[PDB]
Structures are given as C-alpha cells and as structure tokens.
Design a protein around this nucleic acid. Structure first.
Lengths: 120, 148, 153, 120
RNA sequence: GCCCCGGCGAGGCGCAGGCAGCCGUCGAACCGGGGAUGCCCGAAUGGGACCUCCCGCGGCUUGCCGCACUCCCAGUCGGGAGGGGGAACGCGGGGAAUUGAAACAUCUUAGUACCCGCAGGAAAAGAAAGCAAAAGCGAUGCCGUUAGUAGGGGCGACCGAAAGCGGCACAGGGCAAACUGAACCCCGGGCCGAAAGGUUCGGGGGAUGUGGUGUUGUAGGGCCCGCGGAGGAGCCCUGGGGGCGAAGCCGAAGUCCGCUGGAACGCGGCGCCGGAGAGGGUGAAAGCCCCGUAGGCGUAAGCCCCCGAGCUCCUGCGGUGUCCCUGAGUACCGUCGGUCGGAUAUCCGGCGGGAAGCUGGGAGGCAUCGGCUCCCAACCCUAAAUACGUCCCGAGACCGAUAGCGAACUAGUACCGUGAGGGAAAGCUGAAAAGCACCCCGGGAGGGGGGUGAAAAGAGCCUGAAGCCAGGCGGCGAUAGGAGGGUGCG
RNA sequence: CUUGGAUCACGGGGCAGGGAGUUCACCCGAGCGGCGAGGUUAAGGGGGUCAACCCCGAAGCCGCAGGGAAACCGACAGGUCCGCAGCCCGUAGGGCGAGGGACGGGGUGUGAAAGCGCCCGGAGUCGCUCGGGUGAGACCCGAAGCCGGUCGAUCUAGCCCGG
RNA sequence: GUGAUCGGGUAGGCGGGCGUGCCGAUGGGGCGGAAGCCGGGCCGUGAGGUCCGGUGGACCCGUCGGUAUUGCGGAUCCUGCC
C-alpha cells in the first residue's frame, strides 16, 4: 500500500478507518529461521490454524495455536494464553501479531501458496 | 543587525501607555479633525500650522504646458568630457581623423554643452549648441568648435 | 526579509574561510582529533561512489566517522507541541561534501545522519553556518577548489 | 537613543590596539583616530581624491579614519591609509606612484605618527 | 439492501465492546467499474388542494400509454425546445443612507450595501473609419511600472487615468452587395460500405433569391482580355505497432547475551543493512517486530500517435477601362438628464433636425481655413496566457477542548418565537474487563468484610488545584475599642 | 477623576480560567551594515537534491545643475581671512592647519540699473530594526437615531359575508 | 580616583534585567520515575530561581541566536463553581 505522508494524523486516521481488505496485511507476523531457509520469506499475514510462539509479554515462550482473529481491533487469540476471572473461569488474553512468531504454517489453500511464490 | 525591543513590552504596567490623562486618546476631536481638516479655507483650527509650515498650499499659481509639446534636452559639461576621455575614445564618440582630436555630440545624443569645469586637452567639438564660457575655455585649451 | 547580492556573497566567503579554520570547527562541536588536515581536500574519485558501505569505509579512513556517530547520538526527541505536528526528532549536523559535479555521491552518502552533499555552483550560507554558527566540517574536492578559483563566491 | 558601537570585531580590535599604542609610545594621534572611528555610522567620514590632491603635497602622508572614494584626479604621489577603499581609488592612487595601505601598516611603519595628516 | 466483470485471499453482519443466530472456499465482506429496483410532495406538468392527500377523460388488451403553459418545424398524425437548482468567480440594468468635510446644502461615503434579470466551467473582450509624431508600431487579454503624475474639485476635504517602455501568451477567418440563376438545403423509408461516407422514392421549404464567386485602403473585388490549368489539405476504422492509464503487487537488515521493571521500545556489551536513519503502530524512549520509505512492476473500458484505410469540394498569373459594387433615421449638428480624471477637449440615453455614398468618406484634445500624416464605421465568429474554490492531493516559526470553524461528541442538533428569524452545552478506566466470586446487616439504593490488578484507576472512572463544608491536633478564649497591619521584647 | 478622598462622591460577596497600541500603504528621523559618482532590481526566465538554494534580468525610481508661471537661459574639482583637533619648532609661546566659520567671484528670475531672492567649490543610494505622523474598525467597550429589503390584523382598530 | 557642590517624586522621556509559548543550532536529563500539585529549606534589593519530602505516572530543561493571540485586582467586564 502507498503510504507517503509525513503527517501523524493522516497516518493514524488511515490506520483507524482502513478498509477490511488491507487490515490482514497490517496483521502480518514474522517467520522462524527454520521456515525462512525453506520458503525464502520473512513475513506473512496471519491465519487461523497456524502455530505460534510468543516472543514478547508475560506469556513469553508459550507455544500455541491461533483460534480467532479480530481485524476491527487488530488482535488475535492463542490457545494456552488465558487469565482467570474472580469467578474462576478462564478467558483469552488478546495479542498483537508483532509479538508473535509463526512456527508451523497452515497450507491447504492455493492463494496462500500463490502469496509465497509471489514473494519468493 | 541591531535588533532592539518594542516598548509596549515595557509599557506593560503603565496604565496609560504614554498618553497622559485618561481622556486624551479617544477619537477625532483628539486630533482636531480627520485629515487636513481645519487648514484655513473654511475653518481655522490649524491655520497657525499652515502659516508657519505649509504656505503656498492653498490657491493657484500658473499653468502647465502639454507633454506632447514638452521636449527636454540632454546636457553635458566639460568636466564630464574630460573625466570620461578614455571610454568615449575606446568606443565610438571620438574620431581621431586628420589631426588634433574630434568630439562628437552623440554620447547620449545631446544638444547643449555647458561651461562648468576646466578642460585640459585641445579638441574640435561638433554639436548643435555650445555656450560662450565653454567656447572660451576650449579656445584657451587650444581647440576649436564648429557648429553643425 | 530582503538582502543584497554583495552582502550575501561576502557572508558566503567569510563562511568558507571560517570552515577552513581549526579552532572554529572544534568550537562548533565537531570531533576533529583524528581528522588529518582541516581543510580536507580529496580526489575527484569521490564523485562516483554510490554505496553507503563504501562511503562508511572512506570516512573511517579520513577521520569523520566519529562526527557522524556524534550526529547520530545527539539526535533526540523534542519538547513541545511540535510532536503533534510531526517535527520531532531534533536532528544534529554532521559534515559537508562539496562537489563540482555529482556522479553518484549523493545516492552514496545521503542517508548517513547529519551529512549533506552539495555542488559549488549552488552554495549557500545555511550549509556552512547552521544556526548562525560557522565552522562546519567540510570536505572539498580538487574540482571544487578549482571552480572557486574562478567564481570567487 | 543608545549609541552602540561598530559591529565589526576587527574595527573594535583596531580601536583597542590604537588606544594601547598611544599609551605605549606617548602620543595622541592614535587615540584621536580611535574616537573618530567610534563615531556614529550615519556620520562617518567620506573623503575624495579631489580633496586629497587639493590639500596634499608631493610626498605627504595621509590618514583617513573612514572611506576614500574616487571622484577627481591625483596629480602627485601620496601614501594614504584608510579603513575602506574603492576599486577606482586604488587604481588612481597606485597610478601616480602612491600607496594605499591600512592603519595597522601605518602604525608598523611609523609608531610616533610624525608628519601624518588627518583628513576627516 | 439485489445482479455481472475484475482485484485481495479468510473471515464477515455501519457509529456500537450485547443475546440468539445466518452468510462464506461453487471465492465472501472490502475495493474499482458497470447494471436493476427506486413510495409521495417538489420545475411538478391531465385537474384540484385549511394540512406531502384527493378527483378524473380517451385508446388497447386487473394491466398499460397519452392528455400543463408559452413556442419552432409540420399539419389533421407526429417530431422537438424552454421552465427549476448551483459557495465564490462572471455579463447586463436599478440604486440609498450612516459617515467625512471637526456645522452643512455642491462634493464624499458610492456606481457602494441591497434589489431585478441572464450564462458557464471559465465568462467577457478581440483582428484598427486605432496609436502616434520629422521616427515609426502593428488584434485582444493579464503582471510590473508609468503615478498619487496629466488632470478634476465649496480649487476645499479629497478624487484620479492612459499611451509608451519591460515581460506572460500568440492566430486569424466569415457575411451583405456587385456578377450568375435552382446548378441548393432538410425529414422519413429503401439498396451499397466495417464505418467516414456515397445512390434512388415520397414530402417540407426556396424567384420577396436556396447554391456558387467575393470581403478591402496612397484601395479591394466583379465584368472584359489575354497566358497558365498542385485544393489536396483533411474524415473513418475491417486493420498492423507504441505510449499514457483503476482497484492492486515486490521491497534490505537483531526480536543475540546480562540487569531494572507488571511489560523493554530503557541501561550496559557484541553485531548487521543502507538508492531505504521520512512518518506511525506494537504492554515505556525502536534504522534492523509489523505497516511502510528509497526504488521498481502491474492494470479493464476509454483517450492518443506512426503507418495502412477507403472517402470529400471550389479554383491560379499578368494587362486594361468616361462600366459596376463596397452596411442610414446611421455619421453629424443643437438641446435636456446621467455619468467620467475628461477640463470650451469623456462615454451612455431621450427629444427636434439630418448627409455624401469611390472624382467618395473619417481622425489628428475650443471652433474654423489651408497643408501633411494615419485609417475605411454604422453585420458576424474566434483558442492560449486570467479569476474562483460548495471539492481533492499535499504541506505548516498556526490552535490544542472557556482555544480552533457556530459544531473534536446521535450540531445548524436540542431549545426559543405566529412568523421573518435566533441558537447552546457536552473529549480521556486499564496492557488486558481481568467490569468485583462468595459471606453478614438492611424494605431497598446501599454499607462492611473478602477478592482481581503493577497500581482502585471502581464506570458518580487519567491528573484531581482554589473558594466552600465537616472532624481531629495545636494556640487564644465570657471587664472588653479599632481598616484587622508595623517595630520591639516575651 | 478631582485644587482637594476615611468620606454621608463613584466602582468594590469569594475562587479559577479568558481579557485591551495590531496590520498595510505613504512621509520625517535614528542605531547598525553593503556598494559608492553611482546605487538598486520588479514582474519574470533558466538550473537544481525542487515553496529553502544558485545564476541572469536595470524597464523604471532616486542621485550627479539649478533658476523661472512659462518661453528660455545656463555656474568656484579653491582666489583671501579667522581658526578647534592633530602635527613641527621649541619652553610660556610661535608656525602650517583637513573638518568649522566669514569674505570674495559666478548662474538665473525681477528690474534702465544698482541691488535683493533661490542656487553653485562631488555623496548618495540599497537594506534590517526601532520611535513617530496621516489614512484605513486602527488600544478595548457604550448610544439615541438615519437608510434598505422582507414578516405580521390568533392581541387590538375598522369594514364586508354567513350565524 | 573624585563626589560639602550625587541618592524624594504625578504626567512624561531614557537605560538594564525577570518570566511565558514556538522555530534553527548546540549541550544535557528521564519508568532506578518527566511534566503538574501540596508543604517546606536556601540564594536573590526585586521580578523570581533552585533543592528536600510527599502525590503522580511520560516527557522535559539549559546557553546562543530569531519569532509571538507574550505577564491582570478592577472594565455596574465575560464564563463556570461555591
């Protein structure tokens, strides 16, 4: 996407009122070296069914799996990453995919494969 | 260069800003009228100023002739002819033909040669008009004039 | 604000002669303990360098890398409402490269923080005296000095 | 209004040097020239070659606390010292067999200022 | 909210964080392009409106078409135009007063505010019956100067140009008449052609002149004569190539080791890229985590250029003349009103008079005579350079919620007035709701204990000041006289 | 404010935030700076790393000659004196002496003319800042009123129609 | 060094300094706790500056030069609160 503006307010406004076909890109995450030297790609947009390693936060180290993506808030959910309520019931803790590394890809769709052979 | 401070900045705290009593900086009565009002034609507030500083401002003296009729000549003095002797010689005006030296009347294109100034060298000058003093000083320097 | 040509040019010349002095350059804030000459004249082969790595190495061998590093380190986040309007990261000044003809040295050195590249037929007072403080660290070329021998200004 | 002084560090240095040189040698001409250089700018001296030639004589030494301008003709040879010169004045003085120099060099070539003439 | 073609590639159901559920991998939402449906009023239009709802006439098979007013072409059928809207900019008309002159009447304010009408994406002007002066220029329009000048004015206050010089941008064509005389235009249907274009039938007009020629100045054109016979510059797309052109795509390099901390974007150490150290986000201050950036690719329909493509509509050069033509209530003169710097010398209009017309006619700052110089009115079209910004991109020594637009927010909203019209207030939990499980008292709102959290920051939510109020502590305190203070000793 | 305020003269319940010599165009002066008998560019043009930067562009304005209503005419780059600073001789004083002051000579208008007025022995222009004057709302608030175009007779005045 | 021959001040004129917001440069600080708020210590004729403790939870100051919607007790001032 063309974003050529040295005005913070225009930047932030774009980020807030961006259309939905461009939010997946902003939701990109990095890959592991073991997948980079295999596919030749440094980042990809995130997708449910992918396995994840948390590289930042209180759940630093945890390995998990993606079960929910929310574009309107720019967040994701990872099984294994939850806190308890005062009741005692467990609820997910929402993460940003800048703090997350992909360690196993879900490839049962031709369009992801086309993405890869585009950027390799 | 020298950038000095404005004085409203010091008058902040003066209560009048240099104007006197609290009643002196109101309007047009404070000035005696908007503009050059009261100059002596119909009223006489500033008639004193008029007769001290601006006399000959009220009335009519003379006529003007039209611009289609006015032609203003160009004038050079012998001072200039002497102090510009090398440029006019380097380019144009002077023609060193058949002896002596010759000065021509078309530097700017001129009509009158006036007499202010001494002259050192001796030339032969050709111009429309030349003045008696100029003629005398040229003759003395040892040159001659030949009217066109 | 209007200014006259002749005053402008006299000021430009004074700024040149200032940058040619060692104590003014050291007082302005530049690291000069390794620099070799001050004024630093160098061949015209520097016009065709178009890679920031190569320029990094050349500056290390001359002695200006430490001034580039000072520039990078004294870059700071500004105080005020300018941060709303953008205009944060008050950036520091490094050295000038003065060049007769550009043949790649702009692409080559344009990213290094604080550095500027300029030709001699386009020389101004703000490249040489930022903030009204003369003594910027300047690297000239033979072509530039021989073009100044003509211009004188 | 507050009469500041000259803004040229070199003028100021010269003024101090002159006052101290007068103290050293035991004379007055240098202190006099100092207070004439320290006089307001809308008043500083402007002298012409007509004037120099009128009131000078072959071999004389002249000091102008200001600017010398080219308007007139110099018939004989002179040594003129001044702060500023014009191109035409240099030309005309060099021609005729003269010197156009500075007050620093005058104080070098003559500390006591014997025979010098002030033209303001 | 329904359909189709493309892009993106997995989630989605507006501001708006809910319950329950549906759509999507046969390619969605979203983005670009194109289509469908589209209640009533409204120019509002078949006819009517004290309530944005009612009442009808023909013709064809409940369903449909048609029927306002004023006009053009036709004419018994039909085919077409106008009407209303639009911030500022634009053309044409009508036209004040406050105020200033230290009162005021001529002047000024001012050809202003406001009113009436007419157009567009630009409008208006525009091709010398001109400017000038012994020399010369060559349509209009805009900038800078000329210049507060010439010049107007109770000659007061005040008002106020042009030519020229320097530049932007450049471009010229057509009628009327003379001379010919239907050799001409349009509509509808039919046959060729890919089309641009060409050929037949029936109607409308045109001898009160359709078509051709012709267009200007020390003259030009026609008729007559001779000689010569480069309208060939342009229209179209069955064709063959190119460039520009949507949504979009690719895009380098650390999440390395220790400490603080709820969390590194910090502090120490060791590295890497760079045509990329612009800007923003992410649990604190990040060139190397993500978007991007420097720099490269990609695009439909449509617009253009080279060629090939077939296709049009009248004619030059020179001579010679007792032949002809060249715009009328017009030029001009007097008078009245208005307007202008226009002064005995600006422009517009009314009234009364009024020409010549190529052996001719006009201008040259009072009128007239002569001389010289410049030009040919009373019919038409015309790009470029210019003005604006109800909009877009992009920027900022601008403001930062009593500021900045009146409106950072469900704002020209709520609300006020019969009405024309007037007009507010109101931003911020936290990294994550983890938005307080459970127990005791209370009719209940709620209080007290316990819990979450790095911190109650507890939605009556960042920080949380003063004035004000209650309580606790300290000092004084029911025989006492000054604007509530100063100096000194307790 | 006032000659005059503790006043039986005006303003004055408390706190917090807002709140009054600005901008243009011309003119008079100064504090600095550049060039200098010359000074200075405007619109605009070209180049660039593209609102910063660099080069060209003197059209015009001021100045170098003034007098006079106009026609028109058209001047001292120093002849004398007194003399501050500073220099020379010295021992108090005396000599030259720029800038400064006073005479003399000249141009022109007016006049038969003499004499009088203005003028002539080379310094101005271009910028930044500041003080001020004049005009524009012109440091901030306050009128009664004058003019223009639209709205209203559900109040009240009058008239008609039907009750 | 001199001042027996300086030391009150309305209108008014002149000189130097304190403080507030933004720019171009230079030098620094900050989650081991920035700005702001409360109470106190020291310097300063003074306008005001700086430190200690507490509260608070992300930005801020100095010197040089420039710029400005640049300083309040009052207007029968405006807004909000008491």
């Amino acid at each position: 996407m063309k974003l050529d503006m040295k005005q913070p307010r225009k930047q932030r406004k774009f980020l807030y009122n961006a259309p939905l076909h461009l939010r997946g890109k902003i939701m990109s995450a990095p890959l592991s070296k073991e997948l980079r030297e295999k596919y030749g790609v440094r980042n990809l947009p995130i997708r449910v069914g992918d396995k994840v390693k948390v590289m930042r936060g209180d759940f630093k180290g945890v390995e998990g799996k993606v079960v929910e993506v929310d574009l309107r808030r720019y967040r994701i959910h990872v099984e294994g990453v939850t806190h308890k309520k005062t009741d005692g019931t467990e609820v997910f803790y929402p993460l940003h995919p800048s703090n997350v590394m992909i360690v196993e890809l879900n490839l049962e769709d031709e369009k992801r494969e086309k993405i890869i052979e585009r950027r390799a | 260069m020298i950038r000095r401070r404005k004085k409203v900045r010091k008058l902040r705290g003066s209560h009048t800003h240099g104007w006197g009593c609290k009643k002196k900086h109101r309007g047009g009565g404070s000035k005696g009228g908007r503009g050059m009002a009261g100059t002596g034609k119909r009223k006489d507030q500033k008639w004193t100023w008029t007769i001290k500083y601006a006399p000959d401002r009220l009335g009519k003296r003379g006529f003007h002739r039209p611009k289609a009729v006015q032609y203003i000549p160009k004038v050079i003095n012998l001072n200039d002819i002497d102090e510009n002797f090398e440029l006019f010689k380097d380019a144009g005006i002077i023609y060193e033909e058949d002896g002596k030296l010759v000065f021509d009347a078309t530097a700017l294109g001129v009509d009158k040669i006036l007499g202010t100034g001494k002259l050192t060298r001796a030339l032969v000058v050709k111009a429309y008009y030349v003045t008696p003093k100029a003629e005398e000083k040229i003759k003395a320097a040892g040159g001659e004039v030949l009217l066109a | 604000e209007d200014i006259n040509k002749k005053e402008r040019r006299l000021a430009i010349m004074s700024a040149i002669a200032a940058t040619a002095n060692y104590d003014l350059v050291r007082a302005r804030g530049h690291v000069v303990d390794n620099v070799v000459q001050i004024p630093l004249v160098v061949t015209d082969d520097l016009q065709k360098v178009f890679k920031t790595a190569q320029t990094r190495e050349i500056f290390k061998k001359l002695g200006v890398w430490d001034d580039i590093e000072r520039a990078k380190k004294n870059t700071k986040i500004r105080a005020g409402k300018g941060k709303m309007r953008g205009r944060r990261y008050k950036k520091a000044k490094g050295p000038l490269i003065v060049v007769a003809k550009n043949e790649g040295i702009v692409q080559g050195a344009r990213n290094h923080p604080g550095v500027d590249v300029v030709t001699v037929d386009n020389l101004g007072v703000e490249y040489l005296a930022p903030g009204t403080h003369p003594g910027r660290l300047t690297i000239w070329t033979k072509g530039a000095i021989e073009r100044l021998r003509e211009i004188y200004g | 209004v507050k009469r500041t002084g000259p803004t040229d560090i070199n003028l100021r240095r010269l003024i101090r040097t002159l006052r101290k040189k007068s103290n050293e040698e035991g004379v007055k001409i240098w202190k006099d020239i100092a207070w004439r250089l320290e006089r307001p700018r809308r008043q500083r001296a402007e002298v012409n070659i007509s004037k120099i030639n009128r009131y000078t004589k072959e071999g004389d030494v002249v000091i102008v606390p200001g600017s010398v301008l080219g308007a007139g003709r110099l018939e004989h040879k002179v040594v003129v010292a001044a702060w500023k010169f014009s191109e035409a004045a240099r030309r005309k003085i060099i021609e005729a067999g003269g010197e156009a120099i500075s007050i620093e060099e005058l104080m070098e070539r003559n500390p006591k200022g014997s025979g010098v003439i002030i033209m303001e």
